[PDB]
Amino acid sequence: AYFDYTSAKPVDERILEAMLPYMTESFGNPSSVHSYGFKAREAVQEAREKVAKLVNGGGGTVVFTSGATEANNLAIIGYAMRNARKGKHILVSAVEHMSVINPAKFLQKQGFEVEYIPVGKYGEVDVSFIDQKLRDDTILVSVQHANNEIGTIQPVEEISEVLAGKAALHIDATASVGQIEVDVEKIGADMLTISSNDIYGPKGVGALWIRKEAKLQPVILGGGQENGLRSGSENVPSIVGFGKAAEITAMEWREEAERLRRLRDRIIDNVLKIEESYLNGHPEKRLPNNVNVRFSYIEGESIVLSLDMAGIQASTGSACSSTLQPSHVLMACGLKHEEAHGTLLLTLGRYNTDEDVDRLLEVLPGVIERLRSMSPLY
Amino acid sequence: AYFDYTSAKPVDERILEAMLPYMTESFGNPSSVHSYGFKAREAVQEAREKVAKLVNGGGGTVVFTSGATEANNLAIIGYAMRNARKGKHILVSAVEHMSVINPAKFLQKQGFEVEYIPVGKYGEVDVSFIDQKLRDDTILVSVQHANNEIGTIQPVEEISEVLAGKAALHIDATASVGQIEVDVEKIGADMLTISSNDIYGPKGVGALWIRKEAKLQPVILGGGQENGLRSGSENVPSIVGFGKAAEITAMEWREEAERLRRLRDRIIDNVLKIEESYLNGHPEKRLPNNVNVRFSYIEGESIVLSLDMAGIQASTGSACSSKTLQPSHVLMACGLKHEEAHGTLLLTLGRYNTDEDVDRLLEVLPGVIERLRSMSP
Amino acid sequence: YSDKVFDHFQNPRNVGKIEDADGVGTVVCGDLMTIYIKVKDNRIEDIKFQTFGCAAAIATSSMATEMAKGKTIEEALKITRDAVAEALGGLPKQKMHCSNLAADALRRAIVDYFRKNGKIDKIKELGLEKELEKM
Ligand SMILES: Cc1ncc(COP(=O)(O)O)c(C=O)c1O
Ligand SMILES: Cc1ncc(COP(=O)(O)O)c(C=O)c1O
Numbered sequence A: 001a002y003f004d005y006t007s008a009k010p011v012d013e014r015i016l017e018a019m020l021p022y023m024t025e026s027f028g029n030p031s032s033v034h035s036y037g038f039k040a041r042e043a044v045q046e047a048r049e050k051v052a053k054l055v056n057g058g059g060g061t062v063v064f065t066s067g068a069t070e071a072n073n074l075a076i077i078g079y080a081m082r083n084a085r086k087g088k089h090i091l092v093s094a095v096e097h098m099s100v101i102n103p104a105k106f107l108q109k110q111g112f113e114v115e116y117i118p119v120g121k122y123g124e125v126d127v128s129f130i131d132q133k134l135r136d137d138t139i140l141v142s143v144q145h146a147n148n149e150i151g152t153i154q155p156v157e158e159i160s161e162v163l164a165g166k167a168a169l170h171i172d173a174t175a176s177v178g179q180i181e182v183d184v185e186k187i188g189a190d191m192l193t194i195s196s197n198d199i200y201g202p203k204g205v206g207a208l209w210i211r212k213e214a215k216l217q218p219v220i221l222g223g224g225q226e227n228g229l230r231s232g233s234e235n236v237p238s239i240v241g242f243g244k245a246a247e248i249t250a251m252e253w254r255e256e257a258e259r260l261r262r263l264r265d266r267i268i269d270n271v272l273k274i275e276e277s278y279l280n281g282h283p284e285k286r287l288p289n290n291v292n293v294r295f296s297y298i299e300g301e302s303i304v305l306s307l308d309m310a311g312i313q314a315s316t317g318s319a320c321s322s323t324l325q326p327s328h329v330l331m332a333c334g335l336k337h338e339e340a341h342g343t344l345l346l347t348l349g350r351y352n353t354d355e356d357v358d359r360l361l362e363v364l365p366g367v368i369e370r371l372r373s374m375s376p377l378y
Numbered sequence B: 001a002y003f004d005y006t007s008a009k010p011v012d013e014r015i016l017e018a019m020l021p022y023m024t025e026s027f028g029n030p031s032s033v034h035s036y037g038f039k040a041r042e043a044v045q046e047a048r049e050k051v052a053k054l055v056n057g058g059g060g061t062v063v064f065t066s067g068a069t070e071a072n073n074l075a076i077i078g079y080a081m082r083n084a085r086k087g088k089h090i091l092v093s094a095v096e097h098m099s100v101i102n103p104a105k106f107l108q109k110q111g112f113e114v115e116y117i118p119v120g121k122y123g124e125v126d127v128s129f130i131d132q133k134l135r136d137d138t139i140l141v142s143v144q145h146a147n148n149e150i151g152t153i154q155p156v157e158e159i160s161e162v163l164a165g166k167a168a169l170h171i172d173a174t175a176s177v178g179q180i181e182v183d184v185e186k187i188g189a190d191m192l193t194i195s196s197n198d199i200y201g202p203k204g205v206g207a208l209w210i211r212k213e214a215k216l217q218p219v220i221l222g223g224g225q226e227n228g229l230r231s232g233s234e235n236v237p238s239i240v241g242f243g244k245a246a247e248i249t250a251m252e253w254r255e256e257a258e259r260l261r262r263l264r265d266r267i268i269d270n271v272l273k274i275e276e277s278y279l280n281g282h283p284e285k286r287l288p289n290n291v292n293v294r295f296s297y298i299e300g301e302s303i304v305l306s307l308d309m310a311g312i313q314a315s316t317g318s319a320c321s322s323k324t325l326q327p328s329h330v331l332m333a334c335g336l337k338h339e340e341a342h343g344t345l346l347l348t349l350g351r352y353n354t355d356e357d358v359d360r361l362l363e364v365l366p367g368v369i370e371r372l373r374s375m376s377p
Numbered sequence C: 001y002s003d004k005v006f007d008h009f010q011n012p013r014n015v016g017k018i019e020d021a022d023g024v025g026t027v028v029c030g031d032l033m034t035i036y037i038k039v040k041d042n043r044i045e046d047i048k049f050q051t052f053g054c055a056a057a058i059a060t061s062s063m064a065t066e067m068a069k070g071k072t073i074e075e076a077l078k079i080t081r082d083a084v085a086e087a088l089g090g091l092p093k094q095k096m097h098c099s100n101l102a103a104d105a106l107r108r109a110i111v112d113y114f115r116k117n118g119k120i121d122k123i124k125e126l127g128l129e130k131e132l133e134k135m
Helices: A013-024 A035-054 A068-086 A098-107 A127-133 A156-163 A236-271 A300-309 A328-333 A337-341 A354-372 B013-019 B035-055 B068-086 B098-109 B127-133 B156-163 B236-271 B300-308 B329-334 B355-373 C005-010 C055-068 C081-088 C097-116 C120-125 C129-133
Strands: A060-065 A089-093 A113-117 A138-142 A168-172 A191-195 A206-211 A277-279 A290-295 A343-347 B060-065 B089-093 B113-117 B138-142 B168-172 B191-195 B206-211 B277-279 B290-295 B344-348 C023-026 C032-039 C044-052
Touching: A013 A236, A013 B013, A035 A060, A035 A206, A035 A236, A060 A068, A068 A098, A068 A138, A068 A168, A068 A191, A068 A206, A089 A098, A098 A113, A113 A127, A127 A156, A156 A168, A236 A290, A236 A354, A300 A343, A300 A354, A300 C005, A300 C055, A328 A337, B013 B236, B035 B060, B035 B191, B035 B206, B035 B236, B060 B068, B068 B089, B068 B098, B068 B138, B068 B168, B068 B191, B068 B206, B089 B098, B098 B113, B113 B127, B127 B156, B156 B168, B236 B290, B236 B355, B300 B344, B300 B355, C005 C055, C023 C097, C032 C055, C032 C097, C044 C055, C044 C097, C055 C081, C055 C097, C081 C097, C097 C120, C097 C129, C120 C129
Parallel strands: A089 A113, A089 A138, A138 A168, A168 A191, B089 B113, B089 B138, B138 B168, B168 B191
Antiparallel strands: A060 A206, A191 A206, A277 A290, A290 A343, B060 B206, B191 B206, B277 B290, B290 B344, C023 C032, C032 C044
């Protein structure tokens, strides 16, 4: 029973089929001026449009990167550097993925001023901080659509109004694309981060989408592929796969997320009967695929490994599973170091069944009991 | 008849056979502390070792990248940024790939003094220029092992000796792996770039070998994978394929190399026996897979698309095909007049090249050249 | 990861609390542990443990208490972090502090038992003065 979907996802069989011919028969390089390269270019172009179509991204550009991490690096460093003549103040959310938080920390070493936006007990950004700390010199604000640890969905449409086209708005959509509607014009984004594997395409590819006019400095220098914004011969097979995943997600995402929500709820309603258990992140404005619970008196890695020995895959924000520091997200919500130790994160996907849940809910309570009965803390 | 192996190669079928399970059955993330994490974690480390074994890499560390391009970005930018206090002087060969020449140019912008090592007629870096210009404040030298453009093999053994303890030595080994012996201790590499696709593994992954106690700043920032030098969730399948290809290249290159040298030789003898043909780069000290001749009487893209039409996938340094519209930097550096260089043919040979493929080009090429110069200004 | 570590984690030995225990020893991350011993003729007639912490915490606590059971006291003070790391089949770095955890809770238990039975002299004997003070 694999409930660790937000750390890795399998590649959908239909994506693999789209990919394989590009790896062995049409392995041409898009820059080549012959048949083999021309086929190669049609393929990248089709993929580009399927990714753009997925997020209603016609009024902007898709740039293929090696993943959400690079995409984020490029969004933050690429944009700020090229735009520093118009100001140097930046707003970033306290619960962003480290591929946002670390690049902002790099800009802090390069004469940029970065303010990190607090959140509340359920992990939603504080919009009135944004509106209070917005200044004529603020050029960028980076907030995620949704949070992949606690499941919480962010007030991005609200955020877009406040900004009022006075500072560029970056949105990491890594957790949202496939779970909830991702419409760049509806959420007023200027840059969007997309992950292939998060929608069941190959690992090691992603895109940053960039509104027309938003201008950026590159990070990966060399050949000038991606119109000068990302160099290296294009990874055609992955891009095609990424494209096939976008087409599938567009056609199937709604029914899938409704199903996962229903399974999410059965989990939460059952898990939470257990003496001393708590849901982290919002109880409703929450990704259909996320259950994040904590259990008093016990430690998260132990829950995780117990589960595994039953054949159940899961995840924890405990210090014990890293570094040795707990989850920065949990800290920001205002969990104490004690609370964060007993964390269990179960995230759902395309190959889950009611039977997976059956199995989980007959196994868990025995685990929590077995660990509790040894905790000096019980 | 595919003669463009250095632009892109097919993935080897065995590489493929080893990639799939990790896409569908064992799709776990190496950071996970459960069985699927554990398998993925063993799968990655075994590849890392197979890659280290390829270039003799025990006294060092393999860092996975999204490809050569990134690995060069890491070598130059990450090494120079982290070492700047030892000095800010940098030596870069004039015929490096652009993924080395561009980041250096970034550095010049950032205050670093970069000098470009000249080459002779066959594009071979001047080992003497490196002797007399290497200052006390030199921290990094970057010289490719071989040129994928013109085939020339650099004197890396002798360059490594000109140094000795002074500046770290970066070597781009993209052209060379699977072609000629690549040994980090023998060429004296302080850093070494490796390309998966170039050795029949997948596109989208590559590596930087880094000698123990050379220190770099990372480029890709975030989650702390690759021991803090390259964040992001490991592309387990790609890395597996990369290892698998590493394991075949160790066990097959000596021979495949001979086979190709033979084919190159045949090609060499006949193309050269044509109206106004010159051979670019060194004729003897050259990769088993590089034929690149130039013609006075024509343009390159023409010779290329005229070949495509016969069923021949080739490449050109012709300015026409460059989107910026400039001719090859690699060729200008040798000394060619922008005009002379315009009509050049490049023919990268590879694994699935056979005798019959070679006999086709020899039955096709002469007409292509003749019934094209027959319409010349 | 580690081999017999799985077996002591999933099937732990001597979990529990001891009423009218003869010695109770107790110890940067989130690992807290106590050991309980009953002592008859200079032996550990019984040992039970309670720990809160990672899988290696559990494993080492299990192993340590299995190692000490029915042993003389001087035989038990011989149960260093390494005799337990090795005992299981070793552990990886970073999680090795969790072996120090168990070996320390056991020492303290033994040091508790001496401080309660006026055997303060043996505390000196015997190498364990420093750990009484830091308690
Ligand atoms: C010498 C050399 N270095 C670097 C590269 C870059 O490889 P990629 O474009 O796949 O990153 C190439 C090939 O393009 C090359 O020939
Ligand atoms: C919100 C968010 N952003 C970015 C990433 C980066 O993912 P990767 O490690 O695939 O680059 C992740 C993890 O998947 C994530 O959860």
